[PDB]
Structure 1
Amino acid sequence: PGVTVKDVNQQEFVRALAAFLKKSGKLKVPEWVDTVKLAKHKELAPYDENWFYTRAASTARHLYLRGGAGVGSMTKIYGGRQRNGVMPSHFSRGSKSVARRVLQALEGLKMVEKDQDGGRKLTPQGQRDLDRIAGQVAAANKK
């Protein structure tokens, strides 16, 4: 019955773990979450109020796939498409502060720890929790 997050859909997994963080009220949510945009290239605010939980889930899943990635790596991953107005579109990264605060809050629940080199990785506690959540979403997908 071994369940791994890589063995199921990641897009459903991020919803499943965002639900976990929503019901588990331990996230250190800053006061400006209702105002800022997730990226410089993004014109409009997010629609879902639990977007901070969604970002935390997504970066936890990314750190499962590979560790050692810093805030610059996070914003490089979360970059998108800037339409540049009338100029031809280009690629731009997301807000550094949002990813920095998400990562900082991920130390609060003690599942992400900084590394001996640059960046941060998952604790064994986090490695337990990710697949623990993956088990139930796999069960739901099967049934």
Structure 2
Amino acid sequence: PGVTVKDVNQQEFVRALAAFLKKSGKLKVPEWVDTVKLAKHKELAPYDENWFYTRAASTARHLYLRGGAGVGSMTKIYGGRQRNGVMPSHFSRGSKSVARRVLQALEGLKMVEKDQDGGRKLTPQGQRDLDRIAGQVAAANKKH
């Protein structure tokens, strides 16, 4: 009876993992987090000031599900639609300097490591942490 990541709801898992990363306090946060927007198709900066932890949690979860993703892959993952005035909308990618710093910060926690083929993947410690978080989420969901 062991809970894995795929068993629980993904949004609640992301919330719980972001809370765990914030409470840990060992994550490295850039200085410009409060003055930048996450992509060129965004109009405003993110509403949540603790958005870096949420993005790090999402990146860790994605590396859990599909390993070997680089900066370009993460940039494509978080890209979205761009509306440009009186012209038709088009797909647009995210900011590379945010994805790169999220990956570097996760590597600083010994949760993400360089992949032999290329890109980054999860360490056994990161997988253990994610499975523990999934178990906590499942227990909280069942108890209430």
TM-score under structure 2 normalisation?
0.97
Deviation at 1:117, TM superposition (A): 1.3
Q: Deviations over 1:60-105 (max 9, x none)?
A: 0000101000000000000011011221001001000000000000
Q: Deviations over 1:96-118 (max 9, x none)?
A: 00000000001110010001111
State the distance in 1 between where 2:57 and 2:77 align.
Answer: 14
Structure 1 residues 1-143: aligned runs within 5 Å: 1-143=1-143
State the distance in 2 between where 1:128 and 1:86 align.
Answer: 49
Deviation at 1:41, TM superposition (A): 0.6
State the distance in 2 between where 1:102 and 1:18 align.
Answer: 13
State the distance in 2 between where 1:18 and 1:95 align.
Answer: 20
State the distance in 2 between where 1:81 and 1:142 align.
Answer: 37
The unaligned stretches of length 5 or more in structure 2 are none
Deviation at 1:49, TM superposition (A): 1.1
State the distance in 1 between where 2:25 and 2:93 align.
Answer: 29
State the distance in 2 between where 1:142 and 1:39 align.
Answer: 37
State the distance in 2 between where 1:94 and 1:112 align.
Answer: 21
Matched residue pairs, number? 143
State the distance in 1 between where 2:96 and 2:84 align.
Answer: 20
Deviation at 1:50, TM superposition (A): 1.0
SS of aligned partner of 1:12: helix
Deviation at 1:142, TM superposition (A): 1.0
The unaligned stretches of length 5 or more in structure 1 are none
State the distance in 1 between where 2:99 and 2:140 align.
Answer: 30
TM-score under structure 1 normalisation?
0.98
State the distance in 2 between where 1:103 and 1:85 align.
Answer: 34
SS of aligned partner of 2:32: coil
Deviation at 1:119, TM superposition (A): 0.2
Q: Deviations over 1:23-70 (max 9, x none)?
A: 110111010000111111111111111100000000100001010000
Q: % of aligned pairs identical?
A: 100
State the distance in 1 between where 2:86 and 2:98 align.
Answer: 28
